[PDB]
Amino acid sequence: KLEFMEMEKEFEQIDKSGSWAAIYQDIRHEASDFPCRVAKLPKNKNRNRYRDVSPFDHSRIKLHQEDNDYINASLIKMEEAQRSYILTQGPLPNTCGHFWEMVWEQKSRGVVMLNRVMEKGSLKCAQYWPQKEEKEMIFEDTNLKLTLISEDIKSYYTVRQLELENLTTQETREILHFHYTTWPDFGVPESPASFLNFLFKVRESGSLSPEHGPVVVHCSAGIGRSGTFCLADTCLLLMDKRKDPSSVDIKKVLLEMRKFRMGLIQTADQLRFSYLAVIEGAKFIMG
Numbered sequence: 115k116l117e118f119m120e121m122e123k124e125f126e127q128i129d130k131s132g133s134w135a136a137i138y139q140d141i142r143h144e145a146s147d148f149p150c151r152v153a154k155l156p157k158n159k160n161r162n163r164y165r166d167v168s169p170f171d172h173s174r175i176k177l178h179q180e181d182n183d184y185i186n187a188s189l190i191k192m193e194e195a196q197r198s199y200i201l202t203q204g205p206l207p208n209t210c211g212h213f214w215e216m217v218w219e220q221k222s223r224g225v226v227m228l229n230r231v232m233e234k235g236s237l238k239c240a241q242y243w244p245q246k247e248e249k250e251m252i253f254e255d256t257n258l259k260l261t262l263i264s265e266d267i268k269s270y271y272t273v274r275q276l277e278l279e280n281l282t283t284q285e286t287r288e289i290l291h292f293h294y295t296t297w298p299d300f301g302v303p304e305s306p307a308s309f310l311n312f313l314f315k316v317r318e319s320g321s322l323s324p325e326h327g328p329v330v331v332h333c334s335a336g337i338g339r340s341g342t343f344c345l346a347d348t349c350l351l352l353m354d355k356r357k358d359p360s361s362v363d364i365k366k367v368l369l370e371m372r373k374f375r376m377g378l379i380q381t382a383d384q385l386r387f388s389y390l391a392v393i394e395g396a397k398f399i400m401g
């Protein structure tokens with residue numbers, strides 16, 4: 115209703131007075147800090163992509179293995195909004211089996227990729243899915259088979275259809291892979307419009323449905339771009355749900371979210387672009 119005028123205003127105050135970096139640093143200093151012991155054990159040294167990016171022990175996702183259950187991935191559970199995600203780092207060459215085992219055990223329907231294999235001459239993620247078309251892989255360590263099916267490629271993102279099979283029980287599931295292809299690490303999406311459109315493909319696929327396991331979201335470290343993606347999603351939910359959409363405190367929500375995984379949203383501009391995308395995408399949603 116009228117409410118929508120309260121957000122652009124509020125957003126403008128912040129923009130003109132460039133108070134973004136300040137707010138971001140406030141959010142930082144305030145962030146929760148819980149222990150990541152398990153992440154630091156010697157046996158899990160090579161199951162991590164970066165030394166400074168770890169899952170809190172209170173919310174890390176545990177693999178159903180008797181020997182080693184570690185994977186660098188956290189479970190973000192937003193009560194009010196009633197939505198959950200699994201944020202994880204881009205898989206390692208030796209961690210691909212684990213990734214798909216987690217998808218299977220957690221009953222996820224969709225996987226959202228916000229980064230790229232090739233990012234600045236460096237490998238930021240392993241090729242954990244079939245490329246050609248009709249290409250088929252197999253993960254010996256976890257007993258899973260993965261098969262390419264569909265692949266609508268576009269200018270800012272790609273949607274693939276995959277068939278994941280449990281080789282032990284021969285049970286198969288369809289997994290949808292949403293890959294945003296134009297999001298530089300520490301940069302922002304090509305435009306709010308392309309971003310939102312993307313979030314909508316994802317939402318409308320039912321992959322975010324609560325009758326399913328949490329969608330798996332990741333980038334390279336699984337905190338910057340992913341945090342931005344989920345913050346936006348959650349906030350848009352809160353708006354649709356509350357009588358008055360404005361009462362949504364983006365800062366409060368991100369701090370709540372950061373209780374489950376460290377460093378969600380890495381720059382002051384990712385925070386900004388996050389207010390924007392929520393505000394903009396708020397148009398269609400709230401009507």
Ligand SMILES: NC(=O)[C@H](Cc1ccc(C(F)(F)P(=O)(O)O)cc1)NC(=O)[C@H](Cc1ccc(C(F)(F)P(=O)(O)O)cc1)NC(=O)[C@H](CCC(=O)O)NC(=O)c1ccccc1
Nearest residue numbers: 163164165166236237299300333334335336337338339380
């Ligand atoms: N800070 C950093 O940039 C990244 C994390 C990162 C990356 C991307 C993002 C994102 F926002 F882009 P995303 O979308 O993925 O969320 C966020 C955070 N960190 C890092 O890059 C840290 C930097 C570092 C080095 C040494 C030290 C130490 F000497 F002090 P030590 O006591 O720990 O030994 C501490 C930190 N690096 C690393 O942890 C290992 C090198 C250290 C090692 O294992 O020996 N590097 C890589 O894994 C790597 C992988 C692919 C291509 C190139 C590099």
